[PDB]
């Protein structure tokens, strides 16, 4: 399973000038391109070595296209302010995500195109890539207009065809990293809270992709009481980190086992103190 995803945020600046626009591109959990209106180049920039392989015609295209995306969102911010009957004094946010998934065969699996205003669902293309999920009556108006203009049909042609063609190209060219898994480097730590009570903490580091499961079990039986899970987090170097802890009576540490599932492990690992 693989994906390509583009994320766009536009933020109106009522004090002066035009909205802040930030675009980012991903293949699975690897960011590969950026654009930022506040940045000085006014180009789509590379963020992974394997996309720097692309020639100038690629960078001119993506820059032209991303600037046109930027304008579309500027205009959208105006439309929405009118629809929701808001003043020009407030700063508002528009966000768009689109992209495609492929299965292990590299064939079209799924498509995406969804949109939010001030952080709430507005309009989304449904799984079939033919109909829409409008959240409220403003979005309903957009739904009727987009149906009339055959927007679904146009997005479908990209997401089913051209989108997967790029993803395929990128997967080949980035195969040394994008198609390599990095298994978690695991270990455990002990923290005496008192004479009676102690904390075991089970660590997963330097792993890719981000998807991982850490579970504790006491005496070979899943335990959720007295545990904690932190959200999975980026190391900074393209890999991720996570941990899980459990509070345990002092001297009972050997009952408890940490279980680690991840794509880069052929079998799940088990750890014990």
């Amino acid at each position: 399973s693989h994906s390509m995803r583009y994320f766009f945020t536009s933020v109106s600046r009522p004090g002066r000038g035009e909205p802040r626009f930030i675009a980012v591109g991903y293949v699975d959990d690897t960011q590969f391109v950026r654009f930022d209106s506040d940045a000085a180049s006014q180009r789509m920039e590379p963020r992974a070595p394997w996309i720097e392989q692309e020639g100038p015609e690629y960078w001119d295209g993506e820059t032209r296209k991303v600037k046109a995306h930027s304008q579309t969102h500027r205009v959208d911010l105006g439309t929405l302010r009118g629809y929701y009957n808001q003043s020009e004094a407030g700063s508002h946010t528009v966000q768009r995500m689109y992209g495609c998934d492929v299965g292990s065969d590299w064939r079209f699996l799924r498509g995406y195109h969804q949109y939010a205003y001030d952080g709430k669902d507005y309009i989304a293309l449904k799984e079939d890539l033919r109909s829409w999920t409008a959240a409220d009556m403003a979005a309903q108006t957009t739904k009727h207009k987009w149906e009339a203009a055959h927007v679904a049909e146009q997005l479908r042609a990209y997401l089913e065809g051209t989108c997967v063609e790029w993803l395929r190209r990128y997967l080949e060219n980035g195969k040394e990293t994008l198609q390599r898994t990095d298994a978690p480097k695991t270990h455990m730590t002990h923290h005496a809270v008192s004479d009676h009570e102690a904390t075991l903490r089970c660590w997963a580091l330097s792993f890719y992709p981000a998807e991982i499961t850490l579970t504790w079990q006491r005496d070979g039986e899943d335990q959720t009481q007295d545990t904690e899970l932190v959200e999975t987090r980026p190391a900074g170097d393209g890999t991720f980190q996570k941990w899980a802890a459990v509070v345990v009576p002092s001297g009972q540490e050997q009952r408890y086992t940490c279980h680690v599932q991840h794509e880069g492990l052929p079998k799940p690992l088990t750890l014990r103190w």
Binding site: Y6, G25, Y58, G61, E62, K65, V66, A68, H69, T72, V75, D76, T79, L80, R96, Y98, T142, K145, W146, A149, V151, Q154, L155, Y158, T162, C163, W166
Partner: peptide, 10 residues
């Protein structure tokens, strides 16, 4: 690669 054009709301 980005789509050639995205729909405006209006």
């Amino acid at each position: 690669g980005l789509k050639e054009g995205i729909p405006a709301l209006d």
